[PDB]
Nucleic acid binder design. Structure first.
Ligand SMILES: COc1cc([C@@H]2c3cc4c(cc3[C@@H](O[C@@H]3O[C@@H]5CO[C@@H](C)O[C@H]5[C@H](O)[C@H]3O)[C@H]3COC(=O)[C@H]23)OCO4)cc(OC)c1O
Ligand SMILES: COc1cc([C@@H]2c3cc4c(cc3[C@@H](O[C@@H]3O[C@@H]5CO[C@@H](C)O[C@H]5[C@H](O)[C@H]3O)[C@H]3COC(=O)[C@H]23)OCO4)cc(OC)c1O
Ligand SMILES: [Mn+2]
Ligand SMILES: [Mn+2]
Ligand code: NA
Lengths: 481, 188, 480, 187
DNA sequence: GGCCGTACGCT
DNA sequence: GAGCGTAC
DNA sequence: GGCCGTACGCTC
DNA sequence: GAGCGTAC
């Protein structure tokens, strides 16, 4: 057969463009994850890689994720898992890694074979209530497994850990934020749905980077929060220490987010060699695990250190800008969203997750109560129940006879036949009654949540406050004004 | 890198541009060593629409294709100097395979335009599914996509030159906005 | 301070022995090296049976590496690949999907591109493994359990052979025909004083998966009598007469462990160096339908029969198989003859079947004891129920049932764990039918354990069953 | 490649021949950057006993060691030209680690004989519970820190006896090596 | 994700 | 200017 | 087991 | 000879 070159170019490029957009480079607004991240975290959950259990080799975690959910190269799965274990990349790390997972100097993690991993305690909150019919499950790439379309995400992950993905026709750049501030923002939005972005900014001051540092002004933050786009100036934490008589030294303790420390030092060394900057005698990297980030710049005596530092901000990545472009997949489609829109979609997901959980729990409670009602009837008419079973030739006749004589359902009759002889003892009879009474009160509680929208909203609020009090931490990035 | 065929008659000879080395190794074993030649392409190929001539000419992958066809490029292109009468694009049945296919067609339209006009460029039709080309055994890869008697090749035909010129510029060009608009309009 | 001589002697011995007993040499019982055993046990533990769908190779290797093999992924994967190659293994142990390489020496596609599961014959290597037939040992870290040997219900050592380079020694065992091998074991079981020449009436010689030809029984006899010997492997080549007095050589079968592409490359090297003459064209017409096909075109003046005989002496078209039958016997390397290999295998089968019978009897006696309790309960069910109902706790119910109905703890527990559905017509009859069949089963197992001939016959019957299901025609022709 | 130390004083300086690059990367981070140097060895190294001079001199790993020590080999060997007074063999606690260790001692005995005589060659003692899985800071505290580490000084007591030992264990002649294993383990 | 060093023994 | 992060 | 090509978009 | 097959 024959195919037109224009039609072939248009059809093939669209197939790839859309796949990179909806199934690769862009995160979901609900759980803040790209498909690769979601598949790693679901994989870790399915593999039983909880924080209490010992570390598993990275090649084994990747193998299972690749074989079951991600039909792409091992390096694509592994490197995404690595970033999630990096405390300088993720504000709230999603992976707990053992071994060399790389550093701020841009040096990569040791190969998959030399590293071990498991999920962090905060990741359990992303997967919390997943098997409680809270989220829609979809068929995998081959149709031999089941995978989640979205994770319940009991904390606002999109804004908490941010996103940086290059798609086709578009890209995304969301900065990380402080969890305590974000949850407070969701709680403020739940109490007032007509909340202004300036009022949401009373809780969410601005972005909070894991590499700490400094933010120059609230102006750039305001634009990013109001339009979904804006430039935020990130400055290093540098002190001019009076090292003796007339001698000085600049000490850099914090660097901007997504900035290579070794490449930044290389740029200062480039300027000294080319004589583009003057007054620098020595440049050392005194960074250690105990002391943290430490970049020492030695200044000449009678030479102005404050001037050199200000020149270093202008000429080197010692002061870098964060180009905000808040694009997330909203209803399976890309959308430039503002701060309010991101929180609105997240809160709406929480309402759905909690409502679906309550609906699931009620179904299981009503089903169990129905079974207990059958067992209670059986325990009141034991002699008659046993005689009915004994007179029956087959299980089918026993079922029909029990259903007809004791006005029981098909499920109730099966439960009685599956009931063990030990359930006839004194304590075992009282245990069935105690369970049933507690279950009736449980059904009542779940029915209260489903009947009133405010009772449901309060449960969402209470559960979010619980996350805030357990996983909430102090602000790292200082916003200067 | 090219695994050439024994025959030197271009009319009966054909080249298969395979996606990857694993698939390349399978193709070079399952092929007809007399009439079929294999050129493996290591991942995504350079987009000639976004690159300048100095980068295109120094690119290892681009260089290897020109040497394999032995026709030359641009104004120095000669159809009579062609080593193969059939240039088959053999990529995976996935979305990335379609992308490599667009990148190859971008190179063929901008540097070897009379090669498409002569109907020498074809598209292989491998079995659709989750399984890639490198995941397939060497014998079934021949039976389904290489054997002239069982295979289904798609002849790349140029109907409108002015329409195609604007299409490659929109889809593969440096200006993103026109590409973004195309995706938004044709999104499913 | 450490002495250089003492350090060299101790360190080298530690490595030398580890390569010998835990790497390069196969066990005489199951014919496997530790890596192969760990792959097959892994596939079994992973539930990778022939009826179930294929699993990605990287996942199979990961599990094997993580719990039994603390070595490189490539060492595990490449050992698994050979087991899936029909030209490497006479009776392939792994069923692979994707590119697993060919005779031309081109390797298998990387783990990520391949998937695997075990073959139907592999189930016979792992048959009765969880029936206390073999001794289990602690793994490298002590967090898992691994088998020291597989039950191996077919003589795998001689079936698929072995080729391993150790330290101070090496092994080279050729593959054999299963039908011939089982017949050899059956002949040995009937006559323990059997001669190697009498065993050769069943086992004609080695049977390669790549077929071919064997020149003389002389080399085979030496290999079977001493454990060492040279066997000449020749390619199947026919000289066909053509029009105009022209001739051509057609090679349909090549020797074992010979690279087909390298063999063609060697003929092409002799033609360019002018070391051989009378060859006009050299083509590889190998296809899936015809199999192996190497066409050599002969010049009109040149005698094709002469060129062919020169090709056997100058190229790997005729290669020798250097037999060196070294296998681990009682965890120690030993140069063994054909009889010794079959003796150690038959003795392993006797132990596997005896241990299985001992295991099955323990479980049968335990089940009969439980059924005896349930039978008492079903005869006095009104009294049984009343005893349970009057009891406040399970502990009192147990105490009361054991005292009133002369039952044991295991019996009384089984009655309390008995479901109400067991009280129906058919379910009562089912308990009685199971117990009657079990008494006859206990009797059968006791007959096997009491008489060594009854045990030996069961071993024989089970081997004949393998021979009739997995036995195939001879591939390699032995010429005189 | 070799990750050298800052100090140029050979008396206080020491080199660690580590098994693999992952172990090498861990050793280069845990080390004392002033007195300790690291040379990673990519797997099994060439057996000089079985090889001729042209192969030994053309070997990448053998060349890297000669360049690191800067002493030369054979008759052109100079102890005064030594860049390190301590050459530490740091291999995995496994059987393959012991093999790499024998291969290194075979090279040191046949080409750098006075280096062993001067007591410059040492053996690191990691606990048997490999270097590729060894923890960063713990690898320094157990087999590198001069205060509590336990190094084994390689001493040459008998030259005639050692000469015959390397010839038997590492030589071309299999027959004598087979008889040694048979006598000291198989029987 | 392909390229590729070494040990070890036999013929 | 070049390099972020998932893909081949 | 380290070396290392390309697409894709945004802002310096 | 050089290349088989498990190891680093
Ligand atoms: C050689 O066999 C093929 C290779 C490829 C390319 C590739 C191509 C290269 C090249 C390197 C690569 C390499 O990329 C490297 O991956 C590394 C993985 O770890 C991370 C940390 O760092 C990555 C490097 O940033 C990147 O450079 C391959 C990984 O998987 C691929 O698809 C990549 O250097 C030269 O040309 C495609 C094929 O067709 C499918 C092939 O057959
Ligand atoms: C680079 O860094 C290190 C390398 C090594 C060697 C090694 C050394 C090489 C070399 C290659 C190799 C490579 O061997 C290759 O494995 C391949 C795996 O796939 C199969 C298909 O084909 C195998 C090759 O036939 C084999 O040659 C390594 C794999 O595992 C090893 O132990 C090997 O080419 C050049 O020098 C050891 C180290 O410390 C322990 C290192 O740090
Ligand atoms: Mn693909
Ligand atoms: Mn080791
Ligand atoms: Na020969």
């Amino acid at each position: 057969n024959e195919r037109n070159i224009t039609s072939e170019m248009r059809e093939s490029f669209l197939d790839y463009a859309m796949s990179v957009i909806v199934a690769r480079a862009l995160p979901d607004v609900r759980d803040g994850l790209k498909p690769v991240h979601r598949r790693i975290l679901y994989g870790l959950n399915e593999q039983g890689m909880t924080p209490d259990k010992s570390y598993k080799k990275s090649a084994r975690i990747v193998g299972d994720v690749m074989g079951k959910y991600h039909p792409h190269g091992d390096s694509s799965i592994y490197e995404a898992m690595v970033r999630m274990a990096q405390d300088f990349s993720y504000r709230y790390p999603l992976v707990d890694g053992q071994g060399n997972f790389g550093s701020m100097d841009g040096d990569g993690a040791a190969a998959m074979r030399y590293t071990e991993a498991r999920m962090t305690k905060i990741t359990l909150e992303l997967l919390r209530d997943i098997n409680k019919d809270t989220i829609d499950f979809i068929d995998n790439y081959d149709g031999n497994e089941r995978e989640p379309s979205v994770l319940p995400a009991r904390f606002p992950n999109l804004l908490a850990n941010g996103a940086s993905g290059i798609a086709v026709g578009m890209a995304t750049n969301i900065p990380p934020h402080n969890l305590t501030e974000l949850i407070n923002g969701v709680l403020s939005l739940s109490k007032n749905p007509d909340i202004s972005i300036a009022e949401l900014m009373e809780d969410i001051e601005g972005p909070d980077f894991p590499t700490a540092g400094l933010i120059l002004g609230k102006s750039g933050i305001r634009r990013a929060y109001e339009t979904g786009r804006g430039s935020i100036q990130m400055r290093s934490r540098a002190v001019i220490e009076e090292r003796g008589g007339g001698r000085q030294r600049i000490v850099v303790t914090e660097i901007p987010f997504q900035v290579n420390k070794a490449r930044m030092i290389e740029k200062i060394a480039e300027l000294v060699r080319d004589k583009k900057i003057d007054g620098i005698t020595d440049l050392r990297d005194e960074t250690s695990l105990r002391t943290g980030v430490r970049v020492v710049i030695d200044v000449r005596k009678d030479a102005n250190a404050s001037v050199i530092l200000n020149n270093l901000y202008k000429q080197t990545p010692l002061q870098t800008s964060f180009g905000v472009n808040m694009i997330a997949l909203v209803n399976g489609r890309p959308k430039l969203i503002n701060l309010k829109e991101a929180l609105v979609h997240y809160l709406e997901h929480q309402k759905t997750v909690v409502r679906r959980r309550t609906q699931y729990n009620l179904r299981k409670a009503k089903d169990r109560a129905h079974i207990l009602e059958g067992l209670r009837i059986a325990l009141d008419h034991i002699d008659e129940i046993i005689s009915t079973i004994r007179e029956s030739d087959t299980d089918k006749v026993a079922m029909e006879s029990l259903q007809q004589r004791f006005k029981l359902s098909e499920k109730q009759a099966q439960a009685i036949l599956d009931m063990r002889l030990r359930r006839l003892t004194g304590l075992e009879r009282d245990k069935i009654e105690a369970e049933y009474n507690e279950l009736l009160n449980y059904i009542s509680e779940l029915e209260t949540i489903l009947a009133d929208e405010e009772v449901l909203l309060q449960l969402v609020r209470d559960e979010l406050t619980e996350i805030r009090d357990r996983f909430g931490d102090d602000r790292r990035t200082e916003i200067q004004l | 890198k090219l695994a050439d065929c024994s025959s030197k008659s271009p009319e009966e000879c054909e080249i298969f541009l395979v996606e990857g080395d694993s698939a390349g190794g399978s193709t070079k074993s399952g092929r007809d060593s007399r009439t079929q030649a294999i050129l493996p392409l290591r991942g995504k190929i350079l987009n000639v629409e976004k690159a300048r001539l100095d980068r295109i000419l120094n690119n290892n992958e681009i260089r290897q294709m020109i040497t394999a066809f032995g026709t030359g490029i641009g104004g120095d292109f000669d159809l009579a100097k062609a080593r193969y009468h059939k240039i088959v694009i053999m990529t995976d049945a996935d979305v990335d395979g379609a992308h490599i296919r667009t990148l190859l067609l971008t190179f063929f339209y901008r540097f070897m335009r009379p090669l498409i006009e002569a109907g020498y460029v074809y598209i292989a039709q491998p079995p659709t599914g989750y399984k890639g080309l490198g995941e397939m055994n060497a014998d079934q890869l021949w039976e389904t996509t290489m054997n002239p008697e069982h295979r289904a090749l798609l002849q790349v035909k140029l109907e409108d030159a002015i329409e195609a010129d604007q299409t490659f510029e929109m889809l593969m060009g440096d200006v993103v906005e026109n590409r973004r608009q195309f995706i938004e309009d044709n999104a499913v």
